[PDB]
Amino acid sequence: FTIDSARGIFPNTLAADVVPATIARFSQLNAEDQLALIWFAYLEMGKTLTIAAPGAASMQLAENALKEIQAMGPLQQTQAMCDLANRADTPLCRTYASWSPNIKLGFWYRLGELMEQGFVAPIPAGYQLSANANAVLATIQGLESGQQITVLRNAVVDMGFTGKRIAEPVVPPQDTASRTKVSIEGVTNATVLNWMDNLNANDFDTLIELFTSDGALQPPFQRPIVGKENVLRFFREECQNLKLIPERGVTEPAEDGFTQIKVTGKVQTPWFGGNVGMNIAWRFLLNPEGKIFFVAIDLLASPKELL
Template sequence: MSFTIDSALSIFPDTQVADALPAIVKSFNQLNAEDQLALLWFAYTEMGLTITPAAMQAVNMVFAEKNLTQIKQMPALEQTQVMCDLVNHTDTPICRTYASFGTNVKLGFWYQLSEWMKQTIVAPIPENYQLSTKASDLLQAIRKLEGGEQLTVFQKVVINMGYASTSSTPKVTEPVVPPKKAAPRSQVRIKGIDNATVLSYMENMNAFDFQAAVALFVKEGALKPPFQEPIVGQENIFAYMRQECYGLKLLPEQGVCEPAEGEFTQIKVTGKVQTPWFGDSVGINLVWRFLLNPEDKIFFVGIDVLGSPQELLNLGLVQNNAKIELP
């Protein structure tokens, strides 16, 4: 058997992925615009999902400055309408431009709006606004999520806002400022894993050396981000990393290594990732599922949000009960 990208998706099938999160995001998107905006407001003001101001230094917000200034200068009713348009995917110039932003710029966009809402520069949610029954139930469900899962839900919601036509608005990919320098490089240690490729992948990602990280993949290898389809090919993976991965801090903790068919090797690593948006206080529990070819190059890596913090401990239990060695 030779692996395909589709078959690689099924490695380590017992992993406890947070499958409920896409359903919560879907329910969120089915609320009316006012309830969605109110939930976002509660997230910023009541649930402790406070974005760190330092994160704005890591984002090139020049792409959003024109739109933000335009919104800031609008009357309150027009400001509210713009935010509703973003939620409703309305075809407007601002919504089209927003759709072209990368993840970090979108998060920065809403961070700035939320700060202005606190200062009443931008129209806030009315003080006595009453959520609908569906929105109230969803808010309770979100409150019960682990902190990293809450972050994932709200990031996914914000990312999907704006208007993208059928032909799709091309994303902004070229930075106006010079490319960011690599972060200080530090050695990564993962309990149970001594594979040089996996360790190098983690170290390169933490150093924002995406070119070196992509070089670890086979030419037509694939990277599958959480709740997305696989990104195939070194060029596409590199573009994704440059767009989405600056500022992330990968904190792998432990892993297991097993032989797979065709002299491939599959490696599962659990740990956390911290984003510049929420600082060191909240980490998203992740699993990386690597499939390496016989030459120890990455054929596939799937990244998923874990459905339970217990999964972080499961690998330790496996290692204590069975000795797993490379072939």
């Protein structure tokens, strides 16, 4: 096996590829249409989904950029937002690109509050979406909540212009005594259980020791992240305060004393908590010693993809 060939394990797993499909359609749109479409999606979603407040540390890291935009005239505020959507090369776009996803999301969270209040230039009153934009919004509004929030996150992350990396502080791992242990029907594999339990405890230093030196983690609709340095950085930047709720799985032999394990269940992001349960598969390829050579995390097409 190579990392790129391991991508093919459990090929019956039907991923929600409508998500990258919809992001590709979104990316073609006029910048003003991109901003208006997300405004409309965000307003409707907020009627039933409450977004968690951005962390204090995140907001502090975004404060100077938010103040710069708040100080602009309305025309310049709209232009700054269009620059981000267009991935234009500007100082603000380079600052934005240096940020972790959570800082980018917190930035837009605060601009959305200020736009609702009228302190930052809002989407024009009675703005009508382009033909392509109206259809992209219709697609988004027809998706399950877990797919909707993934489209919005991916759209936000893709903005700005690419390097110095700015991320939230890493909260210390959960005290041992208060930690939960997951149970998975059909899976007792210590590596898989330790994966779930250490991620639920934000214990990234214990988690990274489960990998081979050349091992990779593949997040939903992303290329594999390869090697302990890159995987640990990903954990520390993006993987704080998740709740993994694995349900059931299957354990099979693979080539050369390797083991392949597929688990299905749900994950909660701290942005939505129990309000959005994303249907997830984990696909593990373990070496004979039980180290992770490859683990993929897939957003599933529907609840019918759960085992």
